């Protein structure tokens, strides 16, 4: 089995918290990206077996995807907004590292990232 286990989406020992910033990240940021027409390749972990990408998990050692992020938010896995923002950045970065500049998947990622940055620019203050 050449896929690694997916990133954890819950952990009984990791402290849980709900902030208005994390609620914004689920209700506005994640929702906006999730339903976007280019979202689908990013909605679940990269299945390197089914996609026939043997070298993927030899190159990408910190995988991340929006399915994982969605579940983390729904499970109150994050303590703060920065943890979640970091996961989005990891997802985009992995795509830019593994794929060639100008590839369709890169253009899809760039479009989602632009939308992401717009919404993060409008992050609300802590209540
Ligand atoms: C190439 O990047 C991906 N492609 C798919 C994918 N389809 C696919 C397969 C080969 C070539 C091109 C594609 C397109 C997405 C451009 C159509 C599928 C699928 O067909 O179900 C699923 N997950 C992916 C993740 C990725 C992906 C992401 C996201 N980041 O790196 C990779 C690699």
From Swiss-Prot:
<protein>
    <recommendedName>
        <fullName>Bromodomain-containing protein 4</fullName>
    </recommendedName>
</protein>
<feature type="cross-link" description="Glycyl lysine isopeptide (Lys-Gly) (interchain with G-Cter in SUMO2)">
    <location>
        <position position="58"/>
    </location>
</feature>
<comment type="similarity">
    <text>Belongs to the BET family.</text>
</comment>
<feature type="domain" description="Bromo 1">
    <location>
        <begin position="17"/>
        <end position="123"/>
    </location>
</feature>
<comment type="subunit">
    <text>(Microbial infection) Interacts with bovine papillomavirus type 1 regulatory protein E2. This interactions may serve for the tethering of viral genomes to host mitotic chromosomes allowing successful partitioning of the viral genome during cell division.</text>
</comment>
<feature type="site" description="Acetylated histone binding">
    <location>
        <position position="99"/>
    </location>
</feature>
<comment type="function">
    <text>Chromatin reader protein that recognizes and binds acetylated histones and plays a key role in transmission of epigenetic memory across cell divisions and transcription regulation. Remains associated with acetylated chromatin throughout the entire cell cycle and provides epigenetic memory for postmitotic G1 gene transcription by preserving acetylated chromatin status and maintaining high-order chromatin structure. During interphase, plays a key role in regulating the transcription of signal-inducible genes by associating with the P-TEFb complex and recruiting it to promoters.</text>
</comment>
<comment type="subunit">
    <text>Interacts with p53/TP53; the interaction is direct. Interacts (via CTD region) with CDK9 and CCNT1, acting as an associated component of P-TEFb complex. Interacts with RELA (when acetylated at 'Lys-310'). Interacts (via NET domain) with NSD3, CHD4, BICRA and ATAD5. The interaction with BICRA bridges BRD4 to the GBAF complex. Interacts (via NET domain) with JMJD6 (via JmjC and N-terminal domains); the interaction is stronger in presence of ssRNA and recruits JMJD6 on distal enhancers. Interacts with NSD3. Interacts with NIPBL.</text>
</comment>
């Amino acid at each position: 089995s050449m896929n690694p286990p997916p990133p954890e989406t819950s952990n009984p020992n990791k402290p849980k918290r709900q902030t208005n910033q994390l609620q914004y990240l689920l209700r506005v940021v994640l929702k906006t990206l999730w339903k976007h027409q280019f979202a689908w390749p990013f909605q679940q972990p990269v299945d390197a077996v089914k996609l026939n990408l043997p070298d993927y998990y030899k190159i990408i050692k910190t995988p991340m995807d929006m399915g994982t992020i969605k579940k983390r938010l729904e499970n109150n896995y994050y303590w703060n907004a920065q943890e979640c923002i970091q996961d989005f950045n990891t997802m985009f970065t992995n795509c830019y590292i593994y794929n060639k500049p100008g590839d369709d998947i890169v253009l899809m990622a760039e479009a989602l990232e632009k939308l992401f940055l717009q919404k993060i620019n409008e992050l609300p203050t802590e209540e």
